[PDB]
Amino acid sequence: KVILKIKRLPHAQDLPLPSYATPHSSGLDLRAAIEKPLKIKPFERVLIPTGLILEIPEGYEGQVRPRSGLAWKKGLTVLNAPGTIDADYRGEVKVILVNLGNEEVVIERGERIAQLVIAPVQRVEVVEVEVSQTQRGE
Amino acid sequence: KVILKIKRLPHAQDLPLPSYATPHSSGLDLRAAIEKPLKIKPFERVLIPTGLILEIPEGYEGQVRPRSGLAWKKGLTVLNAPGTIDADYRGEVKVILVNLGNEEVVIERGERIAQLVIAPVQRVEVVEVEEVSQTQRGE
Amino acid sequence: KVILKIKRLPHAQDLPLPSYATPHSSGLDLRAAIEKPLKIKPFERVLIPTGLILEIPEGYEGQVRPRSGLAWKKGLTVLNAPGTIDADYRGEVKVILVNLGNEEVVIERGERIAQLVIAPVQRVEVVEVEEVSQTQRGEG
Numbered sequence: 001k002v003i004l005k006i007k008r009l010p011h012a013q014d015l016p017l018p019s020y021a022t023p024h025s026s027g028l029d030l031r032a033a034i035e036k037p038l039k040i041k042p043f044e045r046v047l048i049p050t051g052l053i054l055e056i057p058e059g060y061e062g063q064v065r066p067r068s069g070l071a072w073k074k075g076l077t078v079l080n081a082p083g084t085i086d087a088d089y090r091g092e093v094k095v096i097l098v099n100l101g102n103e104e105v106v107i108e109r110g111e112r113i114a115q116l117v118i119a120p121v122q123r124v125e126v127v128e129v130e131v132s133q134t135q136r137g138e
Numbered sequence: 139k140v141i142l143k144i145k146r147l148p149h150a151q152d153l154p155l156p157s158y159a160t161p162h163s164s165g166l167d168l169r170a171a172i173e174k175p176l177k178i179k180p181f182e183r184v185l186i187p188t189g190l191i192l193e194i195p196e197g198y199e200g201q202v203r204p205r206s207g208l209a210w211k212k213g214l215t216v217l218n219a220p221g222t223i224d225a226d227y228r229g230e231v232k233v234i235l236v237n238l239g240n241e242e243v244v245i246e247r248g249e250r251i252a253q254l255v256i257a258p259v260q261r262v263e264v265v266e267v268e269e270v271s272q273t274q275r276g277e
Numbered sequence: 278k279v280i281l282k283i284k285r286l287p288h289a290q291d292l293p294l295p296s297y298a299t300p301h302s303s304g305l306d307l308r309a310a311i312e313k314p315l316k317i318k319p320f321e322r323v324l325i326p327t328g329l330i331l332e333i334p335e336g337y338e339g340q341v342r343p344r345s346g347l348a349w350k351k352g353l354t355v356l357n358a359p360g361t362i363d364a365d366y367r368g369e370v371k372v373i374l375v376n377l378g379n380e381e382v383v384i385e386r387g388e389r390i391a392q393l394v395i396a397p398v399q400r401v402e403v404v405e406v407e408e409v410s411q412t413q414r415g416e417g
């Protein structure tokens with residue numbers, strides 16, 4: 001099985017480890033490692049720190065995906081979804097939440113704001129050609 | 139060879155089954171299983187039912203992705219894209235469309251509003267460490 | 278061995294070929310093969326040509342993913358992210374940008390606007406059933 005090393009920064013010690021809700025969940029939940037609650041006005045973005053520093057193994061990546069509950073109930077989503085967490089990233093993972101609703105939103109301390117999904121990547125060799133004909137065409 | 143079991147709810151029994159458009163398309167067509175045409179004002183979001191209950195096989199997941207056509211022509215996109223459909227999900231798959239254009243948009247009966255891509259997802263074993271490896275890109 | 282084949286058009290012959298910024302980078306750089314800068318009005322979308330024509334291997338696909346820096350510093354993103362590039366696509370790949378910030382953005386010619394990630398896609402056979410297996414998650 002693939003192992004995922006996670007190191008909890010000072011502002012993520014009291015919060016629980018990212019875990020799977022169900023034995024067939026696709027991703028681990030990400031929490032807002034914030035001090036005081038955060039107020040997100042409509043139509044602007046906010047950089048929320050998670051307090052996690054991960055070692056994603058070779059051949060795999062991390063994807064910061066939105067939470068379906070926060071998206072429908074409050075109009076909140078991850079701006080750059082799917083956030084590409086490269087396997088060689090050693091800094092603090094951060095989530096860019098943006099409010100596409102027309103009404104104020106508040107994110108509390110330790111609230112699940114996104115989900116990190118670990119998936120295999122295919123690194124391709126790039127060659128320039130001068131392509132095959134298909135039925136889909138252009 | 140992998141199979142996908144789909145149960146069509148009564149409001150999706152008349153609509154056609156999800157099918158790959160081309161012999162090498164990546165996703166299935168997701169249709170709005172609604173009776174009346176839906177109007178989405180600018181900056182509005184709607185939860186549209188598909189009438190579909192999926193049996194995504196173990197080791198694979200479902201991703202609700204936006205349509206390139208509706209995105210450019212009208213500004214419609216999936217709010218939680220890529221919408222994660224877990225393998226053990228037995229509920230009715232729903233789609234959250236948001237109108238990020240400047241005009242009102244109408245979603246008609248059984249209209250292609252998203253695409254569902256089946257892709258392999260990797261279950262990992264979470265392990266907490268006190269130090270990570272120093273690496274090229276750094277922070 | 279996996280191989281991605283790219284045919285470049287005249288308006289994208291001077292840009293560097295899409296490559297990985299780091300040996301462990303997930304996605305290739307996608308650049309705007311345009312002429313003049315782009316007047317990105319807030320809350321407006323645009324269709325940018327890259328000048329690339331790809332031949333993705335069967336069972337694989339390409340994904341247009343937003344850049345993190347452009348999303349935080351200027352509020353730009355790919356509207357249809359992730360942009361599904363089908364394996365049988367033989368046309369020019371285009372990127373749909375959109376401004377979600379409160380300032381106008383200027384897009385330079387050849388500037389990195391998104392990343393292209395190659396990932397394996399699984400073809401599946403749609404067999405309609407009258408019952409799905411019971412799980413612990415249940416009907417969510």
Ligand SMILES: O=c1ccn([C@H]2C[C@H](O)[C@@H](COP(=O)(O)O)O2)c(=O)[nH]1
Nearest residue numbers: 064083084085086089093094345346
């Ligand atoms: O939502 C996100 C997306 C990317 N990241 C990380 C993952 C990568 O190491 C960098 C991307 O830096 P770049 O200059 O865009 O290649 O940011 C993040 O922390 N949160």
Ligand SMILES: O=c1ccn([C@H]2C[C@H](O)[C@@H](COP(=O)(O)O)O2)c(=O)[nH]1
Nearest residue numbers: 068069221222223224227231232417
């Ligand atoms: O756009 C979406 C995203 C998720 N779902 C389904 C698939 C997931 O297993 C359930 C539960 O979502 P959750 O991430 O646990 O809030 O919702 C959906 O029907 N449509």
Ligand SMILES: O=c1ccn([C@H]2C[C@H](O)[C@@H](COP(=O)(O)O)O2)c(=O)[nH]1
Nearest residue numbers: 206207341360361362363366370371
């Ligand atoms: O962001 C994107 C998404 C799709 N495309 C292209 C490549 C895909 O094979 C086609 C899909 O177009 P469609 O008419 O939705 O099937 O569009 C693109 O150039 N940029």
Ligand SMILES: [Mg+2]
Nearest residue numbers: 206207208210
């Ligand atoms: Mg098109």
Ligand SMILES: [Mg+2]
Nearest residue numbers: 277345346349
């Ligand atoms: Mg950065």
